Amino acid sequence: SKLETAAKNLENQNKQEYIKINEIDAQGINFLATFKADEKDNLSQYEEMQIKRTIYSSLNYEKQKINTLKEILETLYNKLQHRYTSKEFIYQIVASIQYDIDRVLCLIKEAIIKDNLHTQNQKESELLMNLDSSLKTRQNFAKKLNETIDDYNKDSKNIQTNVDALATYMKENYKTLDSFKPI
Amino acid sequence: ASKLETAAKNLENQNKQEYIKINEIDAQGINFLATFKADEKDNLSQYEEMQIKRTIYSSLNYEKQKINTLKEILETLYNKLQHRYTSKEFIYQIVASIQYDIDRVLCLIKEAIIKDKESELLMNLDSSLKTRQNFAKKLNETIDDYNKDSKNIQTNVDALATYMKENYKTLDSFKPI
């Protein structure tokens, strides 16, 4: 059944991410160390994983790219004026992209288990559509995130040289979760 | 660290350890739900199957012997048309729900951590773990009863059926007060 296959493929997809992420991280790259050291907000180990699922998958598990993004975020964080923009990128955009995907699987699982075939069939189309939309969103974010890594390395619009420039760029390309949704 | 954050962490770690242990046990060819897998009427997906095993295997402490005796119990009941449904209800209605409640709370705790409750989610979380602990207690009492043939439950499938019916009536019976 469609919902049963959907859960299965997501389940395996999840597992593969968990292994890959932990690989990369086993090598001492502390991607979110700076956010971990922050006393104002507490990045739990779950929050952290979710964030990485989206980011790492988005950057194809290329340590180099992840490190660049790390520098971007740590530059912004180390400038009090723009700290918030790093946090918003992390907690408001990246994390939401992930949660949506997770929310739907949490709810597709509910239809598989708790609900009988009739209900199951009612809910079916909408959950599938949402699932799709939430994966596509993450793809569009990823596309955008690679364009940003490249832009950074080329110092396009002085984004490597100028934190203020950098801040504006991150603001204008990551305005809202909804902007990454399919049209 | 917020209470919810620590609640999710401890659940997450607990989940992971269960996955590994379950897979270990299963790697040795014990096909705990084979008979249900072979069933065309209903479908056990490999997720559903894992969830069922989480509650059962953790309840029986990952003791292969105990899991094998439970397997007999369930396959006996399944192979008798009259009582098949009792084996299915035990699996899909009781065990799976006990698991689902737990799983549900975490999916919701996580949700509150990120996108946004506290005291109610913590209550529910406690309740749903307790429920599983009461079920586990009951399940061990059943396996011991079965091995002793108490009330002829190993000797008599009908007797067996009535015992399963009277000790696993509903999910709600395992909840705390």
SS (H, E, C) chain B: CCHHHHHHHHHHHHHHHHHHHHHHHHHCCCCCCHHHHCCCCCCCCHHHHHHHHHHHHHHCCCCHHHHHHHHHHHHHHHHCHHHHHHHHHHHHHHHHHHHHHHHHHHHHHHHHHHHCCHHHHHHHHHHHHHHHHHHHHHHHHHHHHHHCCHHHCCCCHHHHHHHHHHHCCCHHHHCCC
Check B1 against A44: CB less than 8 A apart: yes
The verdict on a CB contact (< 8 Å) between B47 and A1 is no
**Angle, vertex CA A15, rays to CA A11 and CA A19, nearest 5:** 170
Structure tokens at A128: 């599938």
Closest to B7 (Cα-Cα) out of B78, B83, B108, B84: B108
Q: What is the Cα–Cα distance from B149 to B138, expressed in whole angstroms?
A: 16
CA B146 to centroid of chain Cα atoms:
18
Q: Which of A91, A50, A76 is CA-nearest to residue A148?
A: A76
From the CA of B107, how many Å to the nearest CA of chain A?
6
B48 and A113: CB-CB below 8 Å? yes
Cβ count near A35 (within 10 Å): 21
Select the residue of A91, A96, A113 nearest B96 (Cβ to Cβ). A113
> Which among B52, B55, B36, B151 is positioned nearest to B167, based on CA atoms?
B151
Point out residues after which chain A has a gap (C–N over 2.5 Å): none
Radius of gyration of chain B (CA): 17
How far apart CA A22 and CA A108 sit, in angstroms, is: 26
C-alpha to C-alpha distance for B158 and B72, rounded to whole angstroms = 14
Judge whether A11 is closer than 8 Å to chain B, CB to CB. Answer: yes
Integer CA distances (angstroms), A40 to A15, A91, A96, B106, in order? 31, 13, 20, 24
Chain A contact for B67 (CB, 8 A cutoff): no
The answer to whether A54 and A97 are in contact (CB under 8 A) is yes
Residues 6+ apart with CB under 8 A from A120: A3, A111, A112
CB count in 10 Å sphere of residue B97: 21
CA distance A12 to A97: 19
Q: Kindly state the tokens that stand for A33.
A: 């160390």
| A-to-B residue pairs, Cβ atoms closer than 8 angstroms | 59
DSSP-derived 3-state class of residue A111: helix
CB contact under 8 Å between B114 and A103, yes or no, is: no
Mutation test of the interface with chain B: which of A9, A106, A108, A115, choosing the one with the most B Cβ atoms within 10 A?
Answer: A106
C-beta of residue B131 within 8 angstroms of C-beta of residue B176: yes
CA A70/CA A78 separation, integer angstroms:
12
Neighbours of B109 (CB within 10 A): 23
Determine the CATH number of domain B3-174.
Answer: 1.10.3160.10
Report d(CA B44, CA A84) in Å as an integer.
47
Distance CA A137, CA A133 (A): 6
CB–CB contact A103 B111 (8 Å): yes
* CA distance, residue B100 to nearest chain A CA (Å): 8
Helices of type H across A79-177: 83-87, 95-113, 117-153, 163-173
Tokens 């009612």 found at: A122
User: What's the half-sphere exposure (Cβ side, CA atoms, 13 Å) at B40?
Assistant: 0
How are the residues of chain A apportioned to helix, strand and coil, as percentages rounded to the nearest 5?
Answer: 80, 0, 20
So where are chain A's domains?
1-183
Q: Are A46 and B12 in contact (CB under 8 A)?
A: yes
Chain B contact for A9 (CB, 8 A cutoff)? no
Give the rounded distance of the alpha carbon of B159 from its chain centre: 22
User: Could you give the CA distance from residue B73 to residue B47 in angstroms, rounded to a whole number?
Assistant: 23
Q: Where are the alpha helices (DSSP H) in A27-44?
A: 33-36
Q: Does A106 touch chain B (CB under 8 A)?
A: yes
Distance from first CA to last CA of chain A, Å, rounded? Answer: 28
How many angstroms separate the CA atoms of A43 and A35, rounded?
7
CA dist B175 and B133 (Å) reads 9
Residue of A46, A102, A109 with shortest CB distance to B8: A46
Binary contact (A4, B97; C-beta < 8 A):
no
Task: Measure the CA–CA gap between A38 and A36, rounded to whole angstroms.
Answer: 5
Residue of A78, A14, A50, A143 lying closest to B50 (CA atoms)? A14
Give the separation between CA B128 and CA A17, rounded to whole angstroms: 29
Question: Dihedral of CA A65/A68/A72/A77: which sign?
Answer: positive
Could you give the CA distance from residue A11 to residue A104 in angstroms, rounded to a whole number?
12
